[PDB]
Symmetry: C3
Subunit: 342 residues, 3 copies
Amino acid sequence: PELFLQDLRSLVEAARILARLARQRGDEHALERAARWAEQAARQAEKLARQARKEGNLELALKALQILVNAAYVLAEIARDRGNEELLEYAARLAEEAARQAAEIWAEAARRGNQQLRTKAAHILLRAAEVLLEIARDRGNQELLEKAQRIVEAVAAAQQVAALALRLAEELDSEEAKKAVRAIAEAAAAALLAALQGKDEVAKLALKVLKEAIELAKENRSEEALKVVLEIARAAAAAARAAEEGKTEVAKLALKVLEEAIELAKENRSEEALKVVLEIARAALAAAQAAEEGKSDEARDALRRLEEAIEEAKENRSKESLEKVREEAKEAEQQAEDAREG
Amino acid sequence: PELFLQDLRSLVEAARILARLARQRGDEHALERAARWAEQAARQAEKLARQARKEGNLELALKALQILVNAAYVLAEIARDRGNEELLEYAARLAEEAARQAAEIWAEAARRGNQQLRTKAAHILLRAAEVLLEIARDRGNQELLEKAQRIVEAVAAAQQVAALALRLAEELDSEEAKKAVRAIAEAAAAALLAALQGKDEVAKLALKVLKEAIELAKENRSEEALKVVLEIARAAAAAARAAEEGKTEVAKLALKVLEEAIELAKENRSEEALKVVLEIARAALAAAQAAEEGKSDEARDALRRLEEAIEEAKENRSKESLEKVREEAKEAEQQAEDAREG
Amino acid sequence: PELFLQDLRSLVEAARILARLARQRGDEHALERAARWAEQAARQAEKLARQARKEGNLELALKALQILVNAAYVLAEIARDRGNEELLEYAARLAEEAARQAAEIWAEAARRGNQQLRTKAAHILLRAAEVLLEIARDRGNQELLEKAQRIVEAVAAAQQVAALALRLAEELDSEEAKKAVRAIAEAAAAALLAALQGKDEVAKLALKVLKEAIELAKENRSEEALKVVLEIARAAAAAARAAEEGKTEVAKLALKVLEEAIELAKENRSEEALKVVLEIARAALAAAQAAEEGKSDEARDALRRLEEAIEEAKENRSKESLEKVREEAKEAEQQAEDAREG
C-alpha cells in the first residue's frame, strides 16, 4: 500500500550511500551493484505512477514523483565518476520522460478545480529540473541548459497565473468568477506544455496574452466581462495545439489575434464593444482546432481576413466604425463556421 | 490562505534553480531575472509576517519565517557570483531585520504560557544565523562574525533556561511552580534581546544570575522561596531595559545587585532571611525602570546605597546583623519608593 | 515529553552552526565550546533511547535515533578540523554503539507483527551508515569501509526480505500466510545481526537460503508447504546464534544444510516428500541451539550424519529411495533428540 511507498524511499537513500561508498573503495563491483540498486528501484515507481495516473488518483501519484525525481540525483554521482556516458544518457531519458507526466498532473488540477495541488505540482517541476543542474553543474550540455532555463522559466511564471486566480476568487468570492478563475487557470496550464516544447517563444507570449486579461478584468469587470475574459480564457487556450502542430507560424499568429482585442477593451470599453470582443474570440477556439487539424492555408486564409479588420478598428475606431467592426466581427466569426464545417 | 503559503515555497525553490542555472549559462539577463524572482518574493512574506504578528497569530507567523529565512541562502549564491556588494549588503538588511521580529515571537511564548513554541522559535534563530555563515564561509566580515558567534551563543543558552522550567514543572507539577517557571522564562527571554544588542557581556552575565536562581531553588524550595525566586525572576528581567538604554554601566551593575543576594540565600537560609532577600529584589525592578528612565545619577545614587550594605551582610552576617541588614534592606527598598515617585 | 524531543533538535542544529562558526573565527575556545554543545547533548538522548527501549515503546525510540544519528555528522566537521583523533575516535564509538540498538528495534518489528516499522528502521541504518561516509569521504579508514560496504549491503537486502512478505500477504491474504510472512520476516532480521558481525559471508548466504524459500513457495504452495517454509523460516533463523558463537564453521555448515533440501523441494515435489523435508528442518533449529551451546564436535557429529544422507537423496532419488531418505530423515532427526537431551 502506502507502506510500499515508504518501503521504497529507503532503497533510494541506500543507493546514495553504497554508490558513494563503493566509488570510494574501488569496488566497481559494488559501484556497479549500487548503480543497480537504483536502476532496479526507479522502474517499480514509474509503473506505480503509470497505474496511479491510470486510476485518476492525484495525491499518491504526486508523492510518487518526489521519490522518483530524486532518483536522478543519485545516478548522477554514479555515471559521472564511472565516466560512462551510456549510463549518464540513461538518466537523461529517466528525467525527460519523468517530467513528461508531471504536467499532465497539473492539467486536471485546474481543469477539475483543485487549486492547492496546481501549486503542489510546481515543487516536482522545480525539484526535478534541479536534477539536470547538478548533472551539468560543471560538465556542460549546452543544448540541455537551453531547456532548463526555458523550462524553469515556464514553471515560476506558470504558477504566477494561479496567483491572480486566488487573489480574484478571494477579491471576488463569486461563482461567475471562481468558474473563470478555475478555467482561466485550466487554460493557463497549456502554456506549460507549449513552452515545454521546442517553441519557447510561442508560450512566452501565450501567457503574456492572458496577462492583459486580468489587467483588463480588474479595470472593467462586468458580468458580461467575466464571461468576456472566460470566453477568451479557454479560447486562447488551444493556441498551443496549433503550436504543438508545427503551426507555431499559425499559433504565434493565433495567440496574437487576441492581443489587439484585449488592447481594444479598456480604450473603447462599451457593453456593445465588449460583446463584439466577447464574440470575436470564439473563432480562435475554432481556428486553433483548425491549426490542430492541418488547415494552415485555410486558418491563415481566415486569419488574413481579420487583419484588414484589425486595421479597421485600429484605423476607424469611432462609434460608427467600431460598431462597423461589429458587423465585421460577425462576418469574421462566419469564416470559422465555414471552416469548422469544412 | 495557507495555500498561498505553499504557493510561495515553490517560488523560493525556483530562484535557487534559475540563479544557479543562469550563472552557469552566462545569462546575467536571467541571473538578474532569477535575482528578481527572489526579491519579488521575500517581501510578500515580510508583509505577511507583519500582518500575522499584527493579528497575534503565532503558528502561521512562525512558519512565515522558515520560508523567509531560507530566502537569504539563495540570494547569497547570487550576490557572491555577480560580485556586487550592493546586492550582497541587501541580503544583510534582509537577515538582520528578519531575526528582528523573531525574538518578539519568543516573547509572548513564555509571557503567555506556550512552552512548546518557545523551543520552536530557536529553529528560526538557529537556521537563520546559518544564513550569515555560508555568506561568509569563505568571504569574511570580521565584525559580522563577532555577532553570530555572540548570537548563536545567545540562542542555545537561552533555550537552556527553558529546560529547567520543564524539569521543574515536571519535577514539581504545581501552579505555584508552573507560574514562576512560565515567568522565570518570560524573564529569560529578555536576556536574548540584551545580548542581541552590542552589549554581549551584559546578558551573558544576566542569564548567569538567573542560573543560581534554580540552583538555590532546588536546594531550598519553600513556598516563600518559590515566590522569592519568582519575585526575583521578573525582577532581574528589566535589567535589559537598563542595558538597552546605554546604562549597561547601570545594568551590569543592576544585574550584579542580585548576585550576592542569591549567594546569601543558601548560606544564611532563614525564613526571616529569605523574606529579607525576597523583599530586597523589588527595588531592582524599580531601579531598572529608572535606568530605563534615565536617572543613572539617581539609580547609581540608590545603587551606591546597597553597596556598603552589601559590605554589611558580607562583613556582619551573624543573626543580629543579617537581621540588621533586614532593617537595612527595608531602608534600601525605600530609596526606590523615593525614586519611583520621583 | 515530546516537547523535550523537539527541544533537543535545535540544540543539535546549534552545534552545526557554532562549530562551523568558531572554526572560522579562530575561536578554538568556542570551537571547543561548540564541540561541547554536541557532547553534552547526544548523551541525554542515548539515555532517553535506553529508557524508551526499556519501556517497549517503538515510535518514540525510533524518532530518538534520527536525531541522535545526525549528531555524528556534526562532530565529524569538528574533529576533522581540529585534527584530534582522540575526539574523532570518540564519534566512532558514538556511531557503532548507536546502530547497536538500531537492529534490536527491527527485531520485534516482525517478531511482533509491525510491518510498516520494519521498513522504517532501514532509514536509521541507512542514514547512520552515511555518518561514516562523510567522516571518511576523503580521510580513509580502510578497515572501517570494509564494514559500511558490508553493512549497507546488509540493510537494502534485509529490507528486501520484507518485500515478498507484503507481496505474499497481499498476493495471499491469508492467516496461514501472514503468520509465516510475519515469522519468515522475524527470521530474516537475524541475517542483519549475522552479517553485522565480522562474518559477512555467513549471513550473505543466510538470506540467500531464505531466497529459495519463497521461490519454492510461489512454485508449489501447499497448506503443508506454507508450514514447510514456516517450519524452515524460524528454523534457519538460529543459524546466526551459531555464527555468533565462533561456529561460523558450523553455522555456514548449518545454513547450508537446508540449501540442498529447498533444492529437493520442486524436483521431487511430493506431499510425502514435502513432509519429509518439512520434518527434516526441525533438527537445524535444535542443532543451532547446540552450536549456540558449544557442541561443535557434537553438532558436526550430527551434521556429518546427514551428509552421506545428503549424498543419499542426491544419489538415490527414485520413489523408494527418496522415501528411504524419509526413514533416514526420521533417523537424522533423532540425532538432535539425542543431542538436545544431551
